[PDB]
Structure 1
Amino acid sequence: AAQTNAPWGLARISSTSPGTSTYYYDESAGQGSCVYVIDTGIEASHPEFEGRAQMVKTYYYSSRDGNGHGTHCAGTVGSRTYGVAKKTQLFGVKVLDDNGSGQYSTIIAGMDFVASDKNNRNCPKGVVASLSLGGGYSSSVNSAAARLQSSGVMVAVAAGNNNADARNYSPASEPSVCTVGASDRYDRRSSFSNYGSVLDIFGPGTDILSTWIGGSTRSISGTSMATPHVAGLAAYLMTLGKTTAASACRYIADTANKGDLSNIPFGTVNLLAYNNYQA
């Protein structure tokens, strides 16, 4: 399948070169997979989600996304126009308040929630969790992310936006999950992207168009935006049967575009997520 005039990041993940604008992908499109977006919520009523999104948990007075961040990330995973995996099922877990903040105890509870809640959902092709959040190093936060991964969920986490070594941030620094840095449309490391040996992969993160609250759209930047590209890619590849939740991060690294990014610090992987789709 081909989506013309796609957001640059979608085109990038199906291309061996920057500078194109059509996204190519197998029509299975993540059908039969599920992606949890652990964030500020999801505006599931947005036409872009087509009834495939739902809120399943909140720790606050509402499950609604009063911020937009979670809706944007969910759109990059799986919206019809802005999403990588256009037929996946999206499940929202609101661990962040409408200011975008959350306590680590709540975030940990949300991760353990997903590890159990997947047993209440129909995801025959597999389960992914996208975590566009983080703060300073916490062994308890890292352990929660490790549990979620161990339970059979492909965990993708943002590297962080400090232009610093991600070893000092959580859950970015957890070795067993997939830690995602950000790149721009010219294949440069995004100016704010964290780096370091704990990164597994880069995805598009600068000037990413996706869904927003109020049935709208906007373009924003962050490792928060790169992470759902990788989460959606994992769901897509799991639906194709090419990999599993336990092996998808390694598979994405195996099949990535290699050595094509600029300003990658020595010791950080130079790997850009790529779907290897041959139309």
Structure 2
Amino acid sequence: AAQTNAPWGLARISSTSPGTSTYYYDESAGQGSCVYVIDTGIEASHPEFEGRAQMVKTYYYSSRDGNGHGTHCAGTVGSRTYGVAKKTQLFGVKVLDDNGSGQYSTIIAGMDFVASDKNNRNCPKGVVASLSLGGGYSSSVNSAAARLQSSGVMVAVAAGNNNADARNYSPASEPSVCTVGASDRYDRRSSFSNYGSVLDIFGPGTSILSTWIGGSTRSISGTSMATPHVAGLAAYLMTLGKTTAASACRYIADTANKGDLSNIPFGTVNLLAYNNYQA
């Protein structure tokens, strides 16, 4: 399949080079997979989700996304126009309030929720969780992410937006999950992107167009935007049978575009997520 005039990040994920605008992908499109978006929620009624999105849990007085950032992330995972995996099922877990904040204890509960909740969902091709959030180092937050991963969920987490070593942030610093840095449309490391040995992969994170609340759309930037590209890619690859939750991060790293990014500090991987789709 070919989507013309796709957002640059989608085009990038199916290309060996920057500067193109068509997204190429297998028509399977993540059908039969599921992606949990653990965030401010998802506006499931957005036409872009085509009924494939649902809120499954909130820790607040509503499950509505009153912020937009969860909806944006979900859009990059699986919206019809802005998504990587255009036929995946999207499950929203609202661990962040409408100001985008959340206590670590709530975030941890949300991760444990997903590890159990997948047993109540139909995801024959596999389960992914996208965590576009973080904070200072916490062994408890890292352990929660590790449990989620261990339970059979491909966990993708944002590296963080501090232009610093991700070793000092959680869940970014958890070795067993897939930690995602951000790049821009000219293959530069995004100016805000964290880096370090704990990063596994980079994805498009600067100026990313996706869904927003009120049935709208929006371009924003962050490792939060890079993460759902990788989560969506994982779901897509699992539907194709290329990989599994336990080794998707390794598979993505092994099949990535290599050595193409600029301003990658010595000791950080120079790997950009790539679907290796040959039309």
Fold match (TM-score > 0.5): yes
CA deviation after TM superposition for structure 1 residue 272, in Å: 0.0
Equivalent in the alignment of 2:160: 160
Q: For residues 94-134 of structure 1, give each alpha carbon's deviation from its aligned partner in whole angstroms, at most 9, with x where no partner exists.
A: 00000000000000000000000000000000000000000
CA deviation after TM superposition for structure 1 residue 4, in Å: 0.2
Q: For residues 186-228 of structure 1, give each alpha carbon's deviation from its aligned partner in whole angstroms, at most 9, with x where no partner exists.
A: 0000000000000000000000000000000000000000000
Paired with 1:167 and 1:25, the residues of 2 have a C-alpha distance of 34
Paired with 1:116 and 1:63, the residues of 2 have a C-alpha distance of 19
CA deviation after TM superposition for structure 1 residue 60, in Å: 0.1
What SS does the corresponding residue of 2:114 show, helix, strand or coil?
Answer: helix
Q: For residues 32-66 of structure 1, give each alpha carbon's deviation from its aligned partner in whole angstroms, at most 9, with x where no partner exists.
A: 00000000000000000000000000000000000
What SS does the corresponding residue of 1:181 show, helix, strand or coil?
Answer: strand
User: Please, what TM-score do these two structures have when normalized by structure 1?
Assistant: 1.00
What SS does the corresponding residue of 1:86 show, helix, strand or coil?
Answer: coil
In percent, how many aligned pairs have the same letter? 100
CA deviation after TM superposition for structure 1 residue 146, in Å: 0.1
Q: For residues 239-272 of structure 1, give each alpha carbon's deviation from its aligned partner in whole angstroms, at most 9, with x where no partner exists.
A: 0000000000000000000000000000000000
What SS does the corresponding residue of 2:231 show, helix, strand or coil?
Answer: helix
Paired with 2:90 and 2:256, the residues of 1 have a C-alpha distance of 25
What SS does the corresponding residue of 2:34 show, helix, strand or coil?
Answer: strand
What SS does the corresponding residue of 1:155 show, helix, strand or coil?
Answer: strand
Note if 1:92 corresponds to 2:106: no
CA deviation after TM superposition for structure 1 residue 83, in Å: 0.1
CA deviation after TM superposition for structure 1 residue 137, in Å: 0.1
What SS does the corresponding residue of 1:230 show, helix, strand or coil?
Answer: helix
Paired with 1:27 and 1:56, the residues of 2 have a C-alpha distance of 27
CA deviation after TM superposition for structure 1 residue 169, in Å: 0.1
Q: For residues 58-77 of structure 1, give each alpha carbon's deviation from its aligned partner in whole angstroms, at most 9, with x where no partner exists.
A: 00000000000000000000
CA deviation after TM superposition for structure 1 residue 143, in Å: 0.1
Paired with 1:192 and 1:254, the residues of 2 have a C-alpha distance of 25
Runs of at least 4 residues off by over 2 Å: none
What SS does the corresponding residue of 1:219 show, helix, strand or coil?
Answer: strand
Paired with 2:129 and 2:185, the residues of 1 have a C-alpha distance of 25
Give the 5 Å matches for 1:2-81: 2-81=2-81
Paired with 1:218 and 1:144, the residues of 2 have a C-alpha distance of 31
User: Please, what TM-score do these two structures have when normalized by structure 2?
Assistant: 1.00
Equivalent in the alignment of 2:243: 243
What SS does the corresponding residue of 2:10 show, helix, strand or coil?
Answer: helix
Paired with 1:275 and 1:247, the residues of 2 have a C-alpha distance of 15
CA deviation after TM superposition for structure 1 residue 160, in Å: 0.1
- For structure 2, the residue ranges without an aligned partner over 5 or more in a row are none
Q: For residues 1-39 of structure 1, give each alpha carbon's deviation from its aligned partner in whole angstroms, at most 9, with x where no partner exists.
A: 000000000000000000000000000000000000000
What SS does the corresponding residue of 2:36 show, helix, strand or coil?
Answer: strand
What SS does the corresponding residue of 2:210 show, helix, strand or coil?
Answer: strand
- Equivalences, count: 279
